[PDB]
């Protein structure tokens, strides 16, 4: 299975993806505007700027 980050309980996939994710909390490992994740359903919602040409599960 995909392995999670303990701070926000998000379902990360890759170690590069985890080290990109944890910098949003502020720790240093080894872009988009808001990151809201729920607690009772597996559905995170993110926002991205209005000019970017893709919106693949992006607000």
Partner 1 sequence: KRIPRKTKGKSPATAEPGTSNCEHYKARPGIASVQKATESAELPMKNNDEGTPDKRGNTKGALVNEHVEARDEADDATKKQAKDTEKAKAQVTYSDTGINNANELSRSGNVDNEGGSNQKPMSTRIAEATSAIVSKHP
Partner 2 sequence: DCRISFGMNGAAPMIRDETGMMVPFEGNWIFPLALWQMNTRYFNQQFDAWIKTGELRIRIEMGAYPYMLHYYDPRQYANAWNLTSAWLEEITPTSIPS
Partner 3 sequence: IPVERYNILTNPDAPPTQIQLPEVVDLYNVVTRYAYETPPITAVVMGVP
Judged by the rule CB under 8 A, the positions of this chain that interact with partner 1 are 1-4, 11, 40-43, 51, 59
Q: Is residue 33 at the binding interface for partner 3, with CB under 8 A as the rule?
A: yes
Q: Could you give the CA distance from residue 12 to residue 35 in angstroms, rounded to a whole number?
A: 14
Instruction: Give 39's contacts (C-beta < 8 A, 6+ positions apart).
Output: 9
If the CB atoms of residues 4 and 47 are measured against partner 2, the closer one turns out to be 4
Q: Cα–Cα distance between 54 and 59 in angstroms, integer?
A: 10
Known binding-site residue numbers for Zn(2+)? 5, 7-8, 21, 25
Residue 37 touching Zn ion (CB under 5 A): no
């Amino acid at each position: 299975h995909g392995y999670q980050c303990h701070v926000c309980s998000a379902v990360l996939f890759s170690p590069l993806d985890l080290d990109a994710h944890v910098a949003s909390h502020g720790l240093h490992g080894n872009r988009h505007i808001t990151e809201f994740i729920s607690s009772w359903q597996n559905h995170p919602i993110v926002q991205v700027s209005a000019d970017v040409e893709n919106r693949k599960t992006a607000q």
